[PDB]
Coordinates of C-alpha atoms and ligand atoms in Angstrom, one line a residue:
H1257 CA 145.2 35.9 193.4
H1258 CA 145.2 38.7 189.8
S1259 CA 145.9 42.4 190.3
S1260 CA 142.8 43.8 189.4
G1261 CA 142.0 45.3 186.0
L1262 CA 145.2 43.8 184.6
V1263 CA 145.6 40.9 182.6
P1264 CA 146.6 37.2 184.9
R1265 CA 150.4 36.7 183.6
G1266 CA 153.3 34.9 184.8
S1267 CA 153.8 36.9 188.5
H1268 CA 156.7 34.6 190.1
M1269 CA 159.5 32.3 188.1
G1270 CA 157.2 29.3 187.8
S1271 CA 153.8 30.8 186.1
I1272 CA 156.4 33.2 183.4
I1273 CA 159.0 29.7 182.9
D1274 CA 155.0 28.1 182.1
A1275 CA 153.3 30.7 179.7
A1276 CA 156.3 29.7 177.5
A1277 CA 155.7 26.3 175.6
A1278 CA 158.7 25.0 174.6
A1279 CA 160.0 25.8 171.7
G1280 CA 158.6 24.1 168.4
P1281 CA 161.1 22.6 165.8
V1282 CA 161.0 25.9 163.2
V1283 CA 161.6 28.1 166.0
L1284 CA 165.0 26.2 166.7
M1285 CA 165.6 26.3 163.2
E1286 CA 165.0 30.2 163.0
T1287 CA 167.6 30.4 165.9
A1288 CA 170.2 28.2 163.6
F1289 CA 170.3 30.8 160.5
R1290 CA 170.2 33.9 162.9
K1291 CA 173.1 32.6 164.7
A1292 CA 175.1 31.7 161.4
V1293 CA 174.8 35.3 161.0
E1294 CA 175.9 36.7 164.4
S1295 CA 179.0 34.8 164.3
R1296 CA 179.7 35.1 159.8
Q1297 CA 179.1 32.3 158.8
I1298 CA 176.8 33.5 156.2
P1299 CA 176.1 37.0 155.0
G1300 CA 172.3 36.3 154.7
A1301 CA 168.7 34.0 153.5
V1302 CA 165.8 34.6 153.1
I1303 CA 163.9 30.9 153.3
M1304 CA 159.6 30.5 152.3
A1305 CA 157.6 27.6 152.7
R1306 CA 154.0 27.2 150.7
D1307 CA 151.2 24.9 150.4
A1308 CA 148.5 25.1 148.0
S1309 CA 145.5 26.0 150.8
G1310 CA 146.6 28.8 152.0
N1311 CA 147.0 28.2 155.5
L1312 CA 151.4 28.1 155.4
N1313 CA 152.6 31.3 153.9
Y1314 CA 156.1 31.4 155.5
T1315 CA 159.0 34.1 154.5
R1316 CA 161.7 34.6 156.8
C1317 CA 164.7 37.1 156.2
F1318 CA 168.4 36.6 158.1
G1319 CA 171.3 39.0 158.1
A1320 CA 172.9 41.2 155.1
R1321 CA 172.8 41.5 150.7
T1322 CA 176.1 41.9 150.8
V1323 CA 179.4 42.2 153.0
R1324 CA 179.8 45.6 151.5
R1325 CA 178.9 48.3 154.0
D1326 CA 176.9 51.3 152.9
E1327 CA 177.1 55.0 152.9
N1328 CA 175.5 55.0 156.2
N1329 CA 179.0 52.3 156.9
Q1330 CA 175.7 49.9 157.6
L1331 CA 175.3 46.3 156.2
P1332 CA 172.0 46.0 154.0
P1333 CA 169.6 43.7 154.8
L1334 CA 168.6 40.9 152.4
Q1335 CA 164.9 41.0 152.2
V1336 CA 161.9 38.8 150.2
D1337 CA 162.0 41.8 147.1
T1338 CA 165.9 42.6 146.9
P1339 CA 166.8 42.0 143.4
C1340 CA 169.5 38.9 143.5
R1341 CA 171.0 36.5 140.7
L1342 CA 169.1 32.8 140.2
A1343 CA 171.8 31.6 137.7
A1344 CA 170.4 28.2 137.0
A1345 CA 167.5 28.8 139.3
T1346 CA 166.5 30.0 135.4
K1347 CA 166.0 27.0 134.7
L1348 CA 162.3 26.4 135.8
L1349 CA 161.7 29.6 134.5
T1350 CA 163.0 28.7 130.6
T1351 CA 161.3 25.0 131.0
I1352 CA 158.1 26.5 131.6
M1353 CA 158.5 28.7 129.1
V1354 CA 159.4 25.6 126.2
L1355 CA 155.9 23.8 127.9
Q1356 CA 153.7 26.9 126.4
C1357 CA 155.0 26.9 123.2
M1358 CA 154.3 23.4 123.0
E1359 CA 150.6 24.2 124.8
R1360 CA 150.8 26.6 122.1
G1361 CA 151.0 24.5 118.7
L1362 CA 154.5 25.8 117.9
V1363 CA 156.5 23.3 118.9
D1364 CA 156.6 19.5 119.6
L1365 CA 158.9 17.8 122.4
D1366 CA 159.9 14.8 120.1
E1367 CA 161.3 17.1 116.6
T1368 CA 165.0 17.6 116.4
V1369 CA 165.8 20.9 117.1
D1370 CA 166.9 21.2 113.5
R1371 CA 164.1 23.4 112.1
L1372 CA 164.3 26.4 115.0
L1373 CA 168.5 25.6 115.9
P1374 CA 169.9 24.6 112.7
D1375 CA 173.2 25.8 114.2
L1376 CA 172.9 23.6 117.2
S1377 CA 172.5 20.8 114.4
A1378 CA 175.9 21.9 112.4
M1379 CA 177.4 21.5 115.2
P1380 CA 179.9 18.9 116.2
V1381 CA 180.8 16.6 119.2
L1382 CA 184.4 17.3 120.1
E1383 CA 185.8 13.8 120.8
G1384 CA 189.5 15.0 122.2
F1385 CA 192.7 16.8 121.1
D1386 CA 195.6 15.1 119.4
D1387 CA 199.4 15.6 120.7
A1388 CA 199.9 19.6 118.8
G1389 CA 196.6 20.3 121.1
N1390 CA 194.4 20.2 118.0
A1391 CA 191.0 19.7 118.6
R1392 CA 189.3 16.4 117.3
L1393 CA 186.0 17.0 116.3
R1394 CA 183.7 14.7 114.1
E1395 CA 179.7 14.3 112.7
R1396 CA 176.8 14.0 115.3
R1397 CA 175.8 10.2 115.2
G1398 CA 171.6 10.8 115.8
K1399 CA 169.6 14.3 116.6
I1400 CA 168.8 16.3 119.4
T1401 CA 165.3 17.1 120.0
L1402 CA 163.6 19.7 122.6
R1403 CA 163.3 16.5 125.2
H1404 CA 166.8 15.7 125.3
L1405 CA 167.7 19.9 125.9
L1406 CA 165.1 19.9 129.2
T1407 CA 166.4 16.5 130.7
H1408 CA 170.1 17.4 129.6
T1409 CA 170.5 13.9 127.7
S1410 CA 171.7 16.2 124.5
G1411 CA 174.9 15.9 124.8
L1412 CA 176.1 19.4 125.4
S1413 CA 177.6 19.9 128.4
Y1414 CA 179.4 23.4 130.6
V1415 CA 183.6 24.5 129.8
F1416 CA 183.4 24.7 133.9
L1417 CA 182.6 21.0 134.3
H1418 CA 183.8 18.8 131.6
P1419 CA 187.3 18.1 131.4
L1420 CA 187.3 18.2 127.3
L1421 CA 185.6 21.6 127.7
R1422 CA 188.2 22.4 129.8
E1423 CA 191.1 21.1 127.8
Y1424 CA 188.8 23.3 124.5
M1425 CA 188.7 26.5 126.5
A1426 CA 192.6 26.6 128.0
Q1427 CA 193.9 25.6 124.2
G1428 CA 191.9 29.2 122.6
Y1429 CA 189.4 27.3 120.7
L1430 CA 186.9 29.7 123.1
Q1431 CA 188.8 33.1 123.4
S1432 CA 186.9 35.2 120.3
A1433 CA 183.6 33.4 121.7
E1434 CA 182.9 35.8 125.0
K1435 CA 182.0 39.9 125.2
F1436 CA 181.8 41.5 128.2
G1437 CA 183.8 39.2 130.1
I1438 CA 180.8 36.8 129.2
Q1439 CA 181.2 33.7 127.4
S1440 CA 178.9 32.3 124.8
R1441 CA 177.6 29.2 125.9
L1442 CA 176.9 28.8 122.8
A1443 CA 179.7 28.5 121.1
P1444 CA 181.4 25.5 122.9
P1445 CA 180.9 21.8 121.3
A1446 CA 178.9 19.3 122.5
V1447 CA 181.1 16.3 124.0
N1448 CA 178.5 12.8 123.3
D1449 CA 175.4 12.1 121.5
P1450 CA 171.8 12.7 122.4
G1451 CA 170.7 10.0 124.5
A1452 CA 174.0 8.8 125.0
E1453 CA 174.4 10.1 128.6
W1454 CA 173.0 12.9 131.4
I1455 CA 175.1 15.6 131.0
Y1456 CA 174.7 18.5 132.6
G1457 CA 174.8 21.9 130.3
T1458 CA 173.5 24.4 128.1
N1459 CA 170.7 22.9 127.0
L1460 CA 168.3 25.6 128.7
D1461 CA 170.3 28.0 126.6
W1462 CA 169.7 26.6 123.3
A1463 CA 166.1 25.7 124.1
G1464 CA 165.7 29.6 125.0
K1465 CA 167.0 30.4 121.5
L1466 CA 164.7 28.0 120.3
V1467 CA 161.7 29.8 122.4
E1468 CA 163.3 33.2 120.9
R1469 CA 162.2 31.9 117.5
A1470 CA 159.2 29.9 117.9
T1471 CA 157.9 32.9 118.9
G1472 CA 159.4 35.9 117.2
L1473 CA 159.8 38.3 120.5
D1474 CA 164.0 38.1 123.0
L1475 CA 163.3 36.0 125.6
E1476 CA 163.3 39.4 127.2
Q1477 CA 160.2 40.2 126.3
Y1478 CA 158.7 36.7 126.0
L1479 CA 159.3 36.2 130.1
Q1480 CA 157.8 39.5 130.9
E1481 CA 154.2 38.7 128.9
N1482 CA 154.0 35.0 130.0
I1483 CA 155.3 34.4 133.5
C1484 CA 156.0 37.9 134.9
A1485 CA 152.7 39.3 134.0
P1486 CA 150.2 36.4 134.6
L1487 CA 151.8 36.6 138.5
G1488 CA 152.0 40.2 139.1
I1489 CA 156.0 39.9 138.8
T1490 CA 157.8 43.9 138.6
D1491 CA 161.0 42.4 139.3
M1492 CA 162.5 39.4 137.3
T1493 CA 164.6 40.6 134.1
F1494 CA 167.1 39.4 132.2
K1495 CA 168.1 43.1 132.0
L1496 CA 169.3 43.7 135.1
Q1497 CA 171.5 46.7 134.0
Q1498 CA 168.0 48.5 132.4
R1499 CA 166.6 48.5 135.8
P1500 CA 168.3 51.4 137.9
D1501 CA 165.4 51.0 140.2
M1502 CA 166.5 46.7 141.1
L1503 CA 170.5 48.2 140.9
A1504 CA 170.1 50.5 144.1
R1505 CA 168.5 47.7 145.7
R1506 CA 170.5 44.2 144.3
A1507 CA 172.8 42.0 146.5
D1508 CA 175.7 41.4 146.1
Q1509 CA 177.3 38.1 145.9
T1510 CA 179.4 37.0 148.4
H1511 CA 182.3 34.4 148.3
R1512 CA 183.5 31.7 151.0
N1513 CA 187.5 31.7 150.4
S1514 CA 188.2 28.2 150.0
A1515 CA 191.2 28.2 152.4
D1516 CA 190.2 30.7 155.2
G1517 CA 186.5 29.8 155.3
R1518 CA 185.8 33.6 155.6
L1519 CA 183.1 35.9 153.4
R1520 CA 184.5 38.2 150.8
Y1521 CA 182.5 40.9 148.5
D1522 CA 182.9 38.9 145.2
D1523 CA 183.2 41.3 142.2
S1524 CA 181.1 38.4 140.0
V1525 CA 180.8 39.8 136.0
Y1526 CA 176.8 39.1 135.8
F1527 CA 176.7 41.9 138.3
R1528 CA 178.3 44.6 135.8
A1529 CA 176.9 43.2 132.6
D1530 CA 173.8 41.6 131.1
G1531 CA 175.2 40.5 128.4
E1532 CA 174.2 40.9 124.7
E1533 CA 171.9 37.9 124.4
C1534 CA 169.5 35.6 127.0
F1535 CA 171.1 32.6 128.4
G1536 CA 167.7 30.6 129.4
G1537 CA 170.0 28.6 131.8
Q1538 CA 171.5 31.3 134.2
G1539 CA 170.6 34.7 133.7
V1540 CA 167.2 35.8 135.3
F1541 CA 167.7 37.9 138.4
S1542 CA 164.3 38.6 140.3
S1543 CA 163.9 38.4 144.2
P1544 CA 162.9 35.3 146.1
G1545 CA 159.6 36.4 146.4
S1546 CA 158.5 36.7 142.9
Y1547 CA 160.9 33.0 142.0
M1548 CA 158.2 32.2 145.7
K1549 CA 155.0 33.0 143.3
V1550 CA 156.1 31.3 140.3
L1551 CA 156.6 27.9 142.6
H1552 CA 153.4 28.0 144.4
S1553 CA 151.9 28.9 141.0
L1554 CA 152.6 25.5 140.0
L1555 CA 151.8 23.5 142.8
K1556 CA 148.3 25.5 143.0
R1557 CA 147.7 23.9 139.4
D1558 CA 146.4 27.2 139.0
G1559 CA 146.9 28.1 135.1
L1560 CA 148.3 30.6 135.8
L1561 CA 151.7 29.5 133.4
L1562 CA 150.7 26.2 132.4
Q1563 CA 147.3 23.4 132.1
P1564 CA 147.5 21.5 135.1
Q1565 CA 148.4 18.0 133.1
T1566 CA 151.5 19.9 131.7
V1567 CA 152.3 21.5 135.0
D1568 CA 151.9 16.9 135.8
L1569 CA 153.9 15.9 133.1
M1570 CA 157.4 18.4 134.3
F1571 CA 156.8 15.4 137.0
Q1572 CA 156.6 12.4 135.5
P1573 CA 160.7 10.7 135.1
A1574 CA 161.7 11.0 131.8
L1575 CA 164.6 8.5 131.6
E1576 CA 164.4 4.9 130.5
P1577 CA 166.3 2.4 133.2
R1578 CA 169.9 3.5 131.3
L1579 CA 170.0 6.7 131.9
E1580 CA 168.6 6.4 135.0
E1581 CA 171.3 4.3 136.3
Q1582 CA 174.0 6.3 134.5
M1583 CA 172.7 9.5 136.0
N1584 CA 172.1 8.2 139.4
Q1585 CA 175.7 6.4 139.3
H1586 CA 177.2 10.3 138.0
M1587 CA 175.3 12.1 140.4
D1588 CA 176.7 9.6 143.6
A1589 CA 179.8 9.4 142.5
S1590 CA 180.0 13.0 142.3
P1591 CA 179.3 14.7 145.9
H1592 CA 181.3 17.2 144.7
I1593 CA 179.5 18.8 142.0
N1594 CA 176.1 17.7 144.0
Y1595 CA 173.0 18.9 142.1
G1596 CA 170.5 17.9 144.8
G1597 CA 172.1 19.8 147.6
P1598 CA 170.1 19.7 150.4
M1599 CA 168.8 15.9 149.0
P1600 CA 171.3 13.0 151.1
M1601 CA 174.2 12.5 148.7
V1602 CA 173.1 8.4 147.7
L1603 CA 169.3 8.6 146.5
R1604 CA 167.7 6.7 144.1
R1605 CA 166.9 9.8 141.3
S1606 CA 165.2 10.6 137.9
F1607 CA 165.0 13.8 135.5
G1608 CA 162.1 15.7 134.4
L1609 CA 161.1 18.5 133.2
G1610 CA 162.5 21.8 135.5
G1611 CA 164.9 19.4 137.7
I1612 CA 165.4 16.0 139.8
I1613 CA 162.9 14.0 140.7
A1614 CA 163.2 11.9 144.0
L1615 CA 161.7 8.2 143.1
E1616 CA 161.7 7.1 147.1
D1617 CA 161.2 9.1 150.2
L1618 CA 163.9 11.2 151.6
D1619 CA 163.2 9.9 155.0
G1620 CA 160.2 8.4 155.6
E1621 CA 157.5 10.2 156.6
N1622 CA 159.6 13.0 158.0
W1623 CA 160.7 15.1 154.7
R1624 CA 160.8 15.6 150.9
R1625 CA 158.7 12.3 149.5
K1626 CA 158.7 10.5 145.8
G1627 CA 157.7 13.1 143.6
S1628 CA 159.0 15.3 144.8
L1629 CA 160.8 18.2 141.6
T1630 CA 163.7 20.1 142.7
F1631 CA 166.4 22.6 141.4
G1632 CA 169.1 25.2 142.3
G1633 CA 171.5 28.2 141.5
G1634 CA 175.0 28.8 142.4
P1635 CA 175.0 30.9 144.8
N1636 CA 173.2 27.8 147.1
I1637 CA 169.9 28.6 146.3
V1638 CA 167.6 25.6 146.2
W1639 CA 163.8 25.8 146.0
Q1640 CA 160.9 21.9 145.2
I1641 CA 157.9 21.5 144.7
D1642 CA 156.6 18.5 146.7
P1643 CA 152.8 17.3 145.4
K1644 CA 151.8 14.6 147.8
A1645 CA 153.4 16.4 151.3
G1646 CA 151.7 19.6 149.5
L1647 CA 154.6 21.9 150.1
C1648 CA 157.2 23.8 148.3
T1649 CA 160.2 25.8 149.6
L1650 CA 162.6 27.8 148.5
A1651 CA 165.7 28.5 150.4
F1652 CA 167.8 31.2 148.7
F1653 CA 171.4 32.8 149.9
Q1654 CA 173.4 35.1 147.4
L1655 CA 176.7 33.0 148.3
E1656 CA 179.0 31.1 146.3
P1657 CA 180.5 28.5 145.7
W1658 CA 177.9 25.9 144.9
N1659 CA 177.7 23.2 148.1
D1660 CA 178.2 25.6 150.9
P1661 CA 178.1 23.1 153.9
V1662 CA 177.1 25.7 156.4
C1663 CA 174.3 27.4 153.7
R1664 CA 173.4 22.9 153.2
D1665 CA 173.4 22.2 156.4
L1666 CA 170.9 25.7 156.9
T1667 CA 168.8 25.0 154.4
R1668 CA 168.3 20.8 155.2
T1669 CA 167.6 22.3 159.1
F1670 CA 165.0 24.8 157.3
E1671 CA 163.1 22.1 155.2
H1672 CA 163.2 19.6 158.0
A1673 CA 161.8 22.2 160.1
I1674 CA 158.6 23.1 158.0
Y1675 CA 157.8 19.1 157.4
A1676 CA 157.3 18.4 161.1
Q1677 CA 155.1 21.5 161.5
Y1678 CA 153.8 21.2 158.6
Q1679 CA 153.1 18.4 156.0
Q1680 CA 149.9 17.4 155.8
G1681 CA 149.1 13.7 155.0
Ligands
LVA517 C1 176.5 29.9 135.2 C2 175.2 28.8 136.8 C3 175.3 27.5 136.7 C4 175.1 27.0 135.1 C5 175.1 27.2 137.6 O1 174.3 27.5 138.7 O2 175.2 25.6 138.4 C6 175.0 25.1 139.9 C7 173.6 24.5 139.7 C8 174.0 23.4 140.3 C9 172.4 23.2 140.3 C10 174.6 22.7 139.9 C11 175.7 23.0 139.5 C12 176.6 21.8 139.0 C13 178.3 22.4 138.6 C14 178.9 23.5 139.2 C15 179.2 23.5 140.6 C16 177.6 25.3 139.0 C17 178.4 26.4 139.7 C18 179.9 26.6 139.2 C19 179.2 28.0 139.6 O3 180.5 28.1 141.0 C20 181.0 28.5 138.3 C21 179.7 29.3 137.3 O4 179.5 30.2 137.0 C22 181.4 29.5 136.7 C23 180.8 30.4 135.2 O5 179.6 31.2 135.3 O6 181.7 29.9 133.9 C24 175.8 24.4 140.2

């Protein structure tokens, strides 16, 4: 029998193995993350999941915020409050800011940008190059609206992505459009007409300018007053170099070398200068914790950032069938870019306001449902909100390049486990 005055624990190997019930999906997944850190495959990660009710409030942190040893020769930890580079995860923030302007009657989603962005309206479309290497430019056909900006259907693209703009830079057209090693997201020309196709581009950088001009505030002040303050966030900024307290604790970016798969310190220009202006497509620094507050507020429809009906708009398929078709074709053909991150490489999608919408269940009742909204940031950051499942999740790394297979597999493992144990209905 038992020992007098002592809790009756396992007394032999039979009752000690049975004393521990078998490991569920989440515990097994945590082991995968720990092993990835231990085997040096990743520097670290933070994973977070929340429901609306409060019964799911899950945060786990693994590994280091850098590969550079600190003053004590140690590798400091990546924490839920570690300042990180959000890159394109900034786009959700800027989308919210635009939508607030709409709610306050400052802008209309279908008005042309000409009033507030005459500098964008006057910009030509790059069509090609002559034999001498001179750019061939033409007038835009049709007008860009704010809804085109929010849905990436304006005709704007990115210099690092579109072959026309790669050439444009090669020919030297953008050598004066940079300061502190950061290239202007406003200078490059469009590569198509608005409504012609879905093209990932500098749309939210322009939308951010629109917010600035509609409100008379710089995007930094607007951010602070309208997203940070209502959520009690004190560590979310475009101006990292003005926050000594965040600088002292920030993550470093890590890069995985293509040749050997080894992790190395990445001395990113974005961590040495903020730049002269706020680029709402890419420029915010914050912690995983503060980012989850944004996702969670949207999931709860608590009205702190936007009215519930405005949030609902963000989740509606915005593309007419022609564009929906072309986006899916482009994305299906481009697993090397993979905007959808952990999502299946072939999936019926649309675009909402703020990200990609799944138009079908990713794996029946095992994973994200139809109507879920998602996007990411360069350093393998992935976020999603799933209203049907009652969940939102974020996987935060500080590792480039985007679409790193190890991070993608871990992210899938994370979401799969959370859904398996905690999805409702
Ligand atoms: C500048 C940040 C950009 C917009 C970003 O985060 O985009 C993410 C988001 C993801 C959902 C979809 C993406 C689609 C295409 C790219 C592979 C891009 C990453 C490019 C990055 O590795 C190099 C640039 O940072 C070079 C520069 O800054 O000039 C990635």
